[PDB]
Design a binder for these strands. Sequence first.
DNA 1: TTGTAAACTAGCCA
DNA 2: ATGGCTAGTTTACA
DNA 3: TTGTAAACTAGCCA
DNA 4: ATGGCTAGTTTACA
Lengths: 249, 249
Amino acid sequence: LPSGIELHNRDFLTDAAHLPDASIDLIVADPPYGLGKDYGNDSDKRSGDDFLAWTREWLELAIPKLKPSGSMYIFCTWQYAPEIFSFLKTQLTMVNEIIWDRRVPSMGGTTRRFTSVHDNIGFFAVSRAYYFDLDPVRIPYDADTKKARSRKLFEGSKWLEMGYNPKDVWSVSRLHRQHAERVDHPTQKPLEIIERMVLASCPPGGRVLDPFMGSGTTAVACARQGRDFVGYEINESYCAIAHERVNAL
Amino acid sequence: LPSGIELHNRDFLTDAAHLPDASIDLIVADPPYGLGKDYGNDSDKRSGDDFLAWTREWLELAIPKLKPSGSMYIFCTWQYAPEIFSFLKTQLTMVNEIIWDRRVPSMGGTTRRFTSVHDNIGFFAVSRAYYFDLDPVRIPYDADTKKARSRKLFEGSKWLEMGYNPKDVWSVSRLHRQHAERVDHPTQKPLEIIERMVLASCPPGGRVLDPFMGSGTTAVACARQGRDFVGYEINESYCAIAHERVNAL
DNA sequence: TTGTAAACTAGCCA
DNA sequence: ATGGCTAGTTTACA
DNA sequence: TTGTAAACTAGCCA
DNA sequence: ATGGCTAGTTTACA
Ligand SMILES: Nc1ncnc2c1ncn2[C@@H]1O[C@H](C[C@@H](N)CC[C@H](N)C(=O)O)[C@@H](O)[C@H]1O
Ligand SMILES: Nc1ncnc2c1ncn2[C@@H]1O[C@H](C[C@@H](N)CC[C@H](N)C(=O)O)[C@@H](O)[C@H]1O
């Protein structure tokens, strides 16, 4: 693996003390949602107050590892987002709530509620002096859309010439099983949304921590974009896929 | 004023006793977000624990008006949604977190966070037997998309033939000032999303309560779909606009 | 054009 | 306090 | 084709 | 403690 890519097949809650405090620039956290998925383990088989008690345990181990300029993105479901975000507001300050629109809805067969098509991403910061660089994540227009948005009043603006803010709603399809990026992990996140978080909230060459890296999407996003990565995954098969993914760029 | 459609220029919190308990099928609440808007009053000038205390007060008066099959939609901002939704889960059951993608982002000039393009709507129910009808709110395909979505496995299914679930993310654009639906209210909500709430969670002939009706968007929806309405608005100017919007049907 | 899986069925009845 | 019936659920990748 | 407003700037300094 | 000044922010209505 490259220099700052550290892939650890260890339980994060047992091996976090090994990680030095105030040593991480960004935490990309995609922990189990509490939704009953199979990760080769029972991490997602926890529910209710037991899941919320576990979430706080790992968070109180990860927050100290954050530099005074560090930030943190946390994925969760709406079923536990209000409580998770309420706790993290007493430990950090919330900069954004990012809604990942997965375009493809969750299946099941219900007709008594609207279908799940969104995950909740909480953007928190340690202090008001958090590192945020928008320019590498600006989305530039194409020729046609730039012509449709340009006015004499807007001419010369950075949103029109360089690119606009991704906003707090990111419409990106989930990865199909046959998608080129897809690997053998049940909850693989698109590289597009993870790379955006690293390029905007981790200073170039800084260290990013994925307490639960799964298949190493945050590692790939840190290999390219030149950022340092520390990742923990209990599953060995997942840790393997992670290496292969970082050993193919 | 049509029958069943009831408009009041009063404070909801003081006139709550006038509303019989367990008499309302659906509460469509668009309360002040706590963002500093000017409705001719200072109701949106409350903040922090002052706003959440007032939110929990009106919610404690509005909840016992829901009959056992009742439901409630409440708009808010991500800055207070975790706290608001955490309190309501202690009183009611959360069925859904609907994200309104307003398509058009909020303005200001920031480059230190992602821009706001979404409001949070909470779908809470009093009990597990809440009324919910999806057929009136199913979105039928057009000739081109149904051709792209149709497979022999899906042929005959309600979603492909009748229409799909609108999902928990609603991409409806905010109303431009020059839009023909736009009236002189600072935060008018599109009738498309209010009618969806009324058609899915209120039976025809049922009663809808809007404690902060504003320009009367819910009054217009209840009138056009055969639902009874009760609304409150401290601003007489907005109350007037609410009258014209209903009487123009 | 088409097969097919993707973080988030549920209400009855027994 | 608990299963197992049912009708039932979208999009976009290859 | 073009003007224009829409629930959610932010740090600095005289 | 307080404006004011700055560089700065998108779509889709008409
Ligand atoms: N204590 C733990 N330490 C490290 N990893 C864990 C722990 N508990 C669960 N995990 C793993 O955390 C992962 C959570 C996943 N949602 C990560 C997905 C990852 N972002 C991906 O794109 O593949 C699962 O694969 C679990 O096996
Ligand atoms: N105690 C109160 N009682 C009744 N109305 C109030 C109260 N406080 C604030 N309001 C009004 O509630 C409204 C909140 C608005 N978001 C309503 C918008 C409304 N949904 C519309 O589509 O026009 C404002 O117009 C307030 O003037």
